[PDB]
Amino acid sequence: GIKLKRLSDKPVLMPKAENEWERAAVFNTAAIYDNGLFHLIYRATDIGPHAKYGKYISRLGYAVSKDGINFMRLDKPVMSNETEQELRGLEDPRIVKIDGIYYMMYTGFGDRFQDDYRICLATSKNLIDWERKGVVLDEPNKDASLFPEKINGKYVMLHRRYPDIWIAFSDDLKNWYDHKPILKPIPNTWESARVGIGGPPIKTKDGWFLIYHAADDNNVYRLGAVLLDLEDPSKVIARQKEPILEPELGWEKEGYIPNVVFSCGNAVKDDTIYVYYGGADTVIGVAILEMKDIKFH
Amino acid sequence: GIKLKRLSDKPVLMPKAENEWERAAVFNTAAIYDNGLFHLIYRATDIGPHAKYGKYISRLGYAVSKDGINFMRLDKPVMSNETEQELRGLEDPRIVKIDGIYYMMYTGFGDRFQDDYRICLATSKNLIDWERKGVVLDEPNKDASLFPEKINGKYVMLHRRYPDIWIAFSDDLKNWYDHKPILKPIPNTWESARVGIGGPPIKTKDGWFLIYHAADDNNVYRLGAVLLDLEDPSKVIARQKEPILEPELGWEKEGYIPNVVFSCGNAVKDDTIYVYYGGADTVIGVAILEMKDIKFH
Ligand SMILES: OC[C@H]1O[C@H](O)[C@@H](O)[C@@H](O)[C@@H]1O
Ligand SMILES: OC[C@H]1O[C@H](O)[C@@H](O)[C@@H](O)[C@@H]1O
């Protein structure tokens, strides 16, 4: 069934040594198609994003493209480390647009104590000027996004109480209810250690199309695909057995974190899904899936 | 009466050594306030912008700001030299937005023969992806802009048949009529050698507020102010005798072209006009005028 098709044998975005904030790595980017352009809000670090290299700080950059492959980038981050919950920065943003407002969920990494990372919310009208709304769930959690529309009058979010994907609901984004797990790892497979969402889910005639990531027992990260019921997204309609994307190219296999592909963003233009993904926690690539090719056994 | 008030004793944008296309000078920028942000489309050269420095090529960059002083900038130009009319590049853009479309008029400098510079038009929905519409007037001309709305069903443009400011009208942007001069130099003053528009005119209760530039007999460029009738913009209601801005700071007086302030852009936020201007054809500054302070003798 489903396989993502790389648009290039080269990354679409790489670190820039001359800017401290994005000197070492650019990865794990949000992506959205709006007003005739592809927009990336990308994670960037000053040093290799692993504790063995030091106290890396993650910040968020902006890039834009007409074609989804060739990007122009701003010289300064659109969000920087400002709060105590963001001592070590902002990570892995997922963006949806609802009624003219962009809702970005990101991980605020504080590292002040065990499991000091939290899902946080920021909003914008223009993808440049971001207003912090605070922590969303006060618990160790990440890999979160809103659904791109309200379902039955409610905001819906995916999250990740380790090691499973969860869903929850809210009337106002301030308090959440009906938490339940929807997707778990599967033993003795490529998806055995843990799972988490990729980018935000995409609405389809047949259901919500959701890309997810998983790690195996050697911490190799790959992407997979699930389909959720439109009206009750807690119901998994289908889940592909095999991955849709695995580390294959040199810059997916080799980098600060080896053997990783990881998505936080999937932009849609004319029934084609552009999946942006970090390679080896170092660079950003892009692969596509035409909506007509979303087919589960 | 009217004096522009600098927001800073430093430029808001300067050339960038790392990027050849904007290595020498950034100046003469379009400016517009849209969707909560100030946007600049700025002229940039690889080489000092005069024949004495070399065969400079002008290209157009993008910068953005929340506050109108501190800008983030894209790493590549949004328009580059692509046609024969643009052999030496694109200069001095003026932008207005009409019914969701940005209309940029710029000078295409060909330098293939005497007076080979032409007003050209490009349009965009997003300020990044520009569509060329071609030469507007096939004659030696520059310092042109649309009015930011139609007047009595017609597009209106200002232009500059040397050395005077002219106006013309069009049904469709393809053919122009009712050309007439509206503003001339005045002998034995600061505005003796020539005049031309600054940025696009701004609509006011009392008339169209239009900033203009002029050179004196030693080629010192300064800005002035005129008010035009709302319904017939060929009628000058008032013209201030004295300049509203003159080269004063070191980066206005010294640079590739000494003693120049020159505007192609005036963004409006909450009844304040932000006038962006090239200093010495080298850097970009900003000065403001509150609409309540638009008062002519
Ligand atoms: O969220 C905190 C921390 O968690 C993991 O170790 C990785 O995803 C890192 O990139 C991240 O900085
Ligand atoms: O327009 C052609 C040429 O005309 C003048 O010399 C100046 O305004 C230059 O900056 C420009 O390149």
A190, A189, A137, A206: which is closest to A167 by C-alpha?
A: A137
Q: What span, in angstroms and rounded, lies between the C-alpha atoms of B123 and B143?
A: 17
Backbone angles phi, psi at A71, to 5 degrees: -115, 145
* Residues 6+ positions from B235 with CB-CB distance below 8 Å: B228, B229
CB contact under 8 A, B128 and A62: no
Q: Which two tokens stand for residue A278?
A: 């970090």
Q: Which two tokens stand for residue B134?
A: 């071609």
For B20-38, letters b (16+ CB in 10 Å) and e give ebbebbbbbbbbbbeeebb
3-state SS assignment for residue A20: helix
Yes or no: say if A111 and A88 are a contact pair by the CB < 8 Å rule: yes
| DSSP output for A272-292 | EEEEEEEETTTEEEEEEEEGG
Map out the domains of chain B as residue ranges: 5-187+265-289
Partners of residue A37 in chain B, C-beta under 8 Å: 126, 128-129
DSSP A22: G
3-state SS assignment for residue A296: coil
- Burial environment of residue A51 by CB neighbours within 10 A (0 to 12, 13 to 18, 19 or more): exposed
A17 touches chain B (CB under 8 A): no
Partners of residue A74 in chain B, C-beta under 8 Å: 64, 72-75
B72 touches chain A (CB under 8 A): yes
Q: What span, in angstroms and rounded, lies between the C-alpha atoms of A239 and B103?
A: 49
Q: What span, in angstroms and rounded, lies between the C-alpha atoms of B58 and A161?
A: 54
R_g of chain B computed on alpha carbons: 17
Q: What span, in angstroms and rounded, lies between the C-alpha atoms of B117 and A248?
A: 52
DSSP A79: B
Q: What span, in angstroms and rounded, lies between the C-alpha atoms of B240 and A238?
A: 73
Helices (H) and strands (E) in chain A, counts: 1, 21
CA A131, A132, A137, A141 dihedral sign is: positive
Residue labelled with tokens 């990044």: B128
Residue labelled with tokens 């009217």: B2
Ligand 1 center from residue A143 Cα (angstroms): 11
CA B63, A45, A117, A273 dihedral sign is: positive
- Burial environment of residue B192 by CB neighbours within 10 A (0 to 12, 13 to 18, 19 or more): middle
Which residue of chain A has the CA closest to B78? A72
Q: What span, in angstroms and rounded, lies between the C-alpha atoms of A226 and A235?
A: 10
Q: What span, in angstroms and rounded, lies between the C-alpha atoms of B8 and A16?
A: 30
A142, A289, A292: which is closest to A211 by C-alpha?
A: A289
Ligand 1 pocket at CB < 6 A: A 49, 91, 107, 109, 117, 142
Chain B interface disruption, residue of A13, A71, A75, A127, most B CBs within 10 A: A75
Strands B117-124 and B101-109: antiparallel
Q: CA angle at residue B32 from B30 to B37, to 5 degrees?
A: 130
How many alpha carbons lie under 13 Å from residue A56 in its C-beta half-sphere? 23
Q: What span, in angstroms and rounded, lies between the C-alpha atoms of A184 and A214?
A: 10
| DSSP output for chain B | ----EES-SS-SB---TT-GGGSSEEEEEEEEEETTEEEEEEEEESS-SSTTT----EEEEEEEESSSSS-EEBSS-SB---SGGGTTBEEEEEEEEETTEEEEEEEEE--SSTT-EEEEEEEESSSSS-EEEEESSSSS--S-EE-SS-BTTBEEEEE--TTSEEEEEESSSSSEEEEEEEE---TTSTT-SEEEE-S--EE-SSSEEEEEEEE-TT--EEEEEEEE-SS-TTSEEEE-SS-SB---SHHHHSSSSSSBEEEEEEEEETTEEEEEEEETTTEEEEEEEEGGG----
* Residues 6+ positions from B89 with CB-CB distance below 8 Å: B45, B56, B57, B58, B59, B80, B81, B109
Nearest ligand 2 atom, CA B56: 12
What residues does A239 pair with on adjacent strands?
Answer: A226
What residues does B197 pair with on adjacent strands?
Answer: B212
Tell which CATH classification among 2.40.30.260, 2.115.10.20, 3.30.460.80, 2.60.40.10 matches the domain B5-187+265-289.
Answer: 2.115.10.20
3-state helix, strand, coil in chain A (%, to 5): 5, 45, 50
For A36, which of B73, B74, B129 is closest by C-beta distance? Answer: B129
Q: Is the CB of B107 under 6 A from ligand 2?
A: yes
Backbone angles phi, psi at A293, to 5 degrees: -95, 5
Q: What span, in angstroms and rounded, lies between the C-alpha atoms of B173 and B157?
A: 9
A56 touches chain B (CB under 8 A): no
How many alpha carbons lie under 13 Å from residue A39 in its C-beta half-sphere? 22
- Burial environment of residue B133 by CB neighbours within 10 A (0 to 12, 13 to 18, 19 or more): middle
Yes or no: say if B79 and B92 are a contact pair by the CB < 8 Å rule: no
Partners of residue A36 in chain B, C-beta under 8 Å: 125-126, 129
Partners of residue A18 in chain B, C-beta under 8 Å: 18
- Closest ligand to Cα B120: 2
Assign a CATH topology to domain A5-293.
Answer: Tachylectin-2; Chain A (2.115.10)
